[PDB]
Write an enzyme that holds these catalytic residues in place. Sequence first.
Site: not given
Ligand SMILES: COC(=O)c1cc(S(N)(=O)=O)c(Cl)cc1S(=O)(=O)c1ccccc1
Lengths: 260, 261
Positions: A64, A89, A91, A102, A115, A196
Amino acid sequence: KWTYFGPDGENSWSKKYPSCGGLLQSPIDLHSDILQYDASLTPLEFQGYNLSANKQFLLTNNGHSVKLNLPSDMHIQGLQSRYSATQLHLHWGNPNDPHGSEHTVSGQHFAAELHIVHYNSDLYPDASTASNKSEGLAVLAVLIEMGSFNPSYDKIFSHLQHVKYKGQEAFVPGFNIEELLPERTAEYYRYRGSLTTPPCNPTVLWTVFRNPVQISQEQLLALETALYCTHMDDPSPREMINNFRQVQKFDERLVYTSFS
Amino acid sequence: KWTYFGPDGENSWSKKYPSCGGLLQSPIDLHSDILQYDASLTPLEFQGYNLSANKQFLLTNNGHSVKLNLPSDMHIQGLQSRYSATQLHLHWGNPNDPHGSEHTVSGQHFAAELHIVHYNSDLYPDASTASNKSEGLAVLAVLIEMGSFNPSYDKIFSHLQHVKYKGQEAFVPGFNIEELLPERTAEYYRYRGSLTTPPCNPTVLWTVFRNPVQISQEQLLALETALYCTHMDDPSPREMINNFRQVQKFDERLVYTSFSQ
Ligand SMILES: COC(=O)c1cc(S(N)(=O)=O)c(Cl)cc1S(=O)(=O)c1ccccc1
Ligand SMILES: COC(=O)c1cc(S(N)(=O)=O)c(Cl)cc1S(=O)(=O)c1ccccc1
Ligand SMILES: [Zn+2]
């Protein structure tokens, strides 16, 4: 289990991740009419961001985005609890429409967005446990636009080709993550919102810096073209592009700013 | 039932209406990177739009969209079949945020948007049948900005109180629907998309006029306070506000313009 395109894309996330249709969803348009200066928004301090040149940190393609794992002694000081780093990571869009941030500002996308995910380590042992919990997460968001070459961002991008496919991983030597932040980090937007991505939990304190960073046209194109969502052996490869969520309605709510 | 706000809002429509999560979704943001001039996009002709002032047309509130029903003698000339009118309706914001267009231009919302829905009457008996077929529907979209009072739009807005609640109906005298169109109708955006409401079928040939029309602050306020999603006797009233869908991912599509510049 979810994508940004086709039948499993963001309009369908709510079927298996119910929070993605709940309250407090991110991202949002940061437009002028909902901004409110708040003097209580003091500068954050970025502690343990200068990662040991001697340590190596895991870069993974999980399908992703691409994620760089971060150590838990890295943290934000200045919030109501200590929030410890867990990963960063990005986007982005695609070469034919290179506008894949985003968050938007006055309806305008930036080319991309970084992020840096942190979790409330005063309350919870890990981001996993924090993520569905009150005050669980805090994210720093950097807007990215095309401009001069950025050596610091290349410390991540120079490794993209080793993580081209789902499941691939590479080790990245420590560097100073604060180099990825923009000018005048005291200037920021702040609001309560959500992940997000699935599972979209409404547990994120967002800090979006006011000022973007720049990366070169070549760097942006490499980011947009280096990665796939699929395993190396998938006879039907899918490029990792347009991995941003559309802006969400944000009604009868404010975004607070540390600047006027 | 589906709404624009809360647990049954647009991120949940796909749970009951699968097309809401599929291809070719509308509305979209119109911005430079996805526009392409197409010299074959010749002007539309609006036939039988001047509805007799001595006839009456039904206005209805079904709880989701207040629609003015239009006669099938009203039609567009110029597309690949005759498309006859079925209904028109609007989308808008709310009193404290009059920015409720569905399509956006270069990331910005207009105050509201008018849609004049037509169906392929050469192939199909009615809009309902047409709505399930590729290009069965054609909509003309007019972007609406806050500006001067508009007497033509007032010919619709002056009747909304008789349809304040779900399940209400009223009659509107005929007027010249073409008065609702902007200047230079030859200049438009064209693309393939979908209904912007459930059930979101990807069966609409969209024409969004390039130029907006103006209605006043007062007419916006009146429209944003006039109508309810709910029955007159409902103990949980819900205002009909913010009835616009967020723009959708483009999924590789382009938008074709009849203007070069
Ligand atoms: C699949 O998740 C991600 O990609 C992601 C993305 C965000 S984001 N894009 O809002 O910063 C956060 Cl805060 C945190 C994550 S994360 O820490 O990867 C995650 C994954 C599964 C459950 C809980 C948290
Ligand atoms: C519930 O539907 C509407 O509200 C709507 C809205 C659109 S829009 N708002 O995309 O113009 C069209 Cl084309 C057509 C319609 S519609 O003609 O009302 C309709 C209703 C149910 C099924 C198929 C079509
Ligand atoms: Zn409509």
